[PDB]
Design a protein around this ligand. Structure first.
Ligand SMILES: *[C@@H]1O[C@H](CO)[C@@H](O[C@H]2O[C@H](CO)[C@@H](O[C@@H]3O[C@H](CO[C@H]4O[C@H](CO)[C@@H](O)[C@H](O)[C@@H]4O)[C@@H](O)[C@H](O[C@H]4O[C@H](CO)[C@@H](O)[C@H](O)[C@@H]4O)[C@@H]3O)[C@H](O)[C@H]2NC(C)=O)[C@H](O)[C@H]1NC(C)=O
Ligand SMILES: *[C@@H]1O[C@H](CO)[C@@H](O[C@H]2O[C@H](CO)[C@@H](O)[C@H](O)[C@H]2NC(C)=O)[C@H](O)[C@H]1NC(C)=O
Ligand SMILES: *[C@@H]1O[C@H](CO)[C@@H](O[C@H]2O[C@H](CO)[C@@H](O)[C@H](O)[C@H]2NC(C)=O)[C@H](O)[C@H]1NC(C)=O
Ligand SMILES: O=C1N[C@@H]2[C@@H](O)[C@@H](O)[C@H](O)[C@@H](CO)N2C1=O
Ligand SMILES: [Ca+2]
Length: 475
């Protein structure tokens, strides 16, 4: 049953890994339609590193060894492109760190070469060392777009909320494993400005803050509140840091609880045509933006995690409502895959979507699907927290729809219109998170229990970074 399904996901992973190895390895990614390669992540082999934690969990030794051997020859000091501190941190840094915690722990019997495993930590350190100058600013808020050779930057005056608040988990984990406090100090200092917002007008409601921060003084530059892309990950890490080490980050939890409560009270929103559906809106100076993104669907999972860890049934209940809403965007389309963005503002319903809106509860703003995992991610937590089978089926239904409409001879491709036969047209693009997240959460939902699985209450020994890379908790 679930075993057969678990094997089905491993086949889909193997399928993409074979196509990647066949036409793109060691480049960052496979272009799934032309069977070529691309390097959108500085050329260190993003898809190989992002696939590591998933391969280890799936018990694929051959894949794990091939990746470890490539990690050994990476020179993180050379790249012809500018580097994103955020992208590099959540994929490469967390990816190697995850592999290390996994192979050194619950998966210790999977690989023989202990040198390739220790190399993961060494390379993680080398990577942080080449990037840390990004934090050398007046406030400590880093420049996200840097040139690692000249030490130059974007010239940017502000740094985004998510790009600033989604670094602490992996940089602190690096300090905890190396004994060198420098990494934790830098990221935590940048995070400090987000925990104590100034001006006070940048925090419209308790716990909800603006979307950008001034690099010079660390003050917020706007009061736009949102859980959408650009903001998302900041709130996610608030509660996750608490799970990582409740003794050191109790303060992060308090801030998350404030954010969670204000979100329920002010951002909660129901479509006119479907009062039974719940989505999150955006807020700016008293005005509400009645639209959301596939990216935002990570929210249900956040509420569920904090809910079970804090034993707050109200967060769990709200999280389930967010999960239902996102599930609604998936099962209402022709392909059974949800759109990249949608809206429910009665005054802006497109004429050609009027009837869709009346029955579904929303209209599609962008119908593309770029292999994102947020909806499956939240379905995964819903199942782990409630133990209900329905959420596991929703993961399966989504996986089959992706495998059926996105699959190509070499891998999986992004699609242009989830509300058209076969997804409209295929994009020649396969992001590394296909390996890291879509395949992992889909597999975990049907695989056996293990330390790396999300747990209820205070039993978690691993916490997932925003790219689905399991990191071992502190102590
Ligand atoms: C396509 O997407 C649809 C939208 O997500 C999805 O619809 C359903 O999805 C959920 C299916 O389980 C369903 O949620 C459940 O709703 C139960 C009934 O709700 C009604 O009664 C309650 C009274 O308490 C009212 O408050 C509601 O407004 C509504 O009138 C509810 O009993 C149930 O709660 C139990 O289970 C949860 C955990 O699963 C516990 O936490 C809880 O304590 C209860 O034990 C749960 O909330 C949801 O209502 C429904 N959505 C809508 C709007 O229709 C479709 O299933 C999906 N289609 C396919 C084919 O996949
Ligand atoms: C990062 O900064 C370095 C500076 O060392 C840039 O190096 C290039 O600078 C010029 C750009 O055309 C040319 O002189 C060479 O291409 C090269 N020379 C140096 C100084 O090494 C590099 O282009 C920057 N990275 C990018 C592409 O943004
Ligand atoms: C995902 O898609 C693949 C390919 O369409 C399915 O595997 C197929 O493998 C062969 C063709 O590629 C054939 O044997 C079948 O078309 C099919 N496999 C079976 C079941 O016979 C794969 O089953 C799909 N995954 C799921 C679980 O639906
Ligand atoms: O804006 C984004 N945030 C998410 C990330 O948190 C991660 O899930 C993937 O990089 C990818 C997944 O949808 N990310 C984005 O594009
Ligand atoms: Ca994420």
């Amino acid at each position: 049953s679930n075993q057969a399904k678990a094997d089905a996901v491993k086949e889909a992973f193997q399928h993409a890994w074979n196509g990647y190895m066949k036409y793109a390895f060691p480049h960052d990614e496979l272009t799934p339609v032309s069977n070529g390669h691309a390097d959108s992540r500085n050329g260190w082999g993003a898809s190989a590193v992002d696939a590591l934690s998933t391969a280890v969990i799936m018990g694929k030794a051959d894949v794990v060894n091939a990746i470890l051997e490539h990690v050994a020859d990476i020179d993180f000091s050379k790249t012809s492109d500018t580097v994103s501190l955020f992208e590099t941190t959540i994929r490469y840094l967390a990816g190697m760190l995850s592999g290390y915690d996994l192979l050194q722990g619950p998966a210790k019997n999977l690989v023989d070469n202990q040198d390739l495993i220790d190399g993961l930590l060494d390379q993680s350190r080398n990577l942080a060392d080449v990037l840390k100058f990004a934090f050398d600013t007046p406030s400590g808020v880093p420049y996200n777009n840097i040139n690692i050779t000249s030490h130059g930057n974007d010239g940017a005056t502000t740094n985004g909320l998510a790009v600033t608040g989604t670094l602490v988990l992996e940089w602190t984990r690096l300090s905890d494993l190396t004994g060198d406090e420098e990494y934790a100090k830098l990221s935590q200092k940048a995070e400090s400005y987000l925990l104590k917002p100034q001006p006070s007008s940048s925090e419209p409601f308790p716990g909800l803050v603006g979307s950008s921060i001034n690099i010079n003084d660390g003050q917020f530059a706007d009061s736009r509140v949102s859980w959408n892309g650009g903001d998302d990950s900041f709130y996610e890490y608030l509660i996750k840091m608490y799970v990582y080490d409740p003794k050191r980050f109790e303060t992060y939890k308090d801030r998350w609880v404030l954010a969670a409560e204000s979100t329920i009270k002010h951002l909660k929103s129901h479509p006119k045509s479907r009062p039974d559906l719940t989505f999150l809106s955006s807020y700016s100076n008293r005005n509400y933006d009645l639209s959301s993104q596939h990216l935002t669907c990570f929210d249900g999972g956040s509420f569920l995690l904090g809910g079970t860890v804090l034993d707050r049934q109200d967060f769990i209940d709200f999280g389930l409502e967010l999960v239902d809403g996102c599930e609604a965007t998936y099962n209402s389309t022709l392909t059974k895959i949800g759109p990249d963005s949608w809206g429910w503002d009665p005054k802006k319903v497109p004429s050609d979507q009027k009837e869709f809106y009346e029955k579904a509860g929303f209209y599609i703003s962008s119908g593309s699907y770029v292999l994102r995992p947020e909806v499956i991610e939240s379905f995964y937590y819903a199942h782990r927290v409630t133990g209900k089978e329905i959420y596991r089926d929703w993961v399966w239904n989504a996986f089959v729809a992706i495998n059926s409409t996105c699959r190509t001879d070499s891998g999986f491709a992004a699609v242009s219109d989830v509300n058209k036969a076969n997804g409209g047209s295929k994009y020649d693009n396969q992001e590394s998170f296909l390996f890291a997240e879509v395949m992992k959460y889909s597999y975990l939902a049907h695989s056996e229990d293990a330390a790396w699985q999300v747990q209820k209450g205070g039993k978690n020994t691993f916490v997932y970074n925003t790219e689905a890379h399991p990191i071992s908790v502190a102590r």
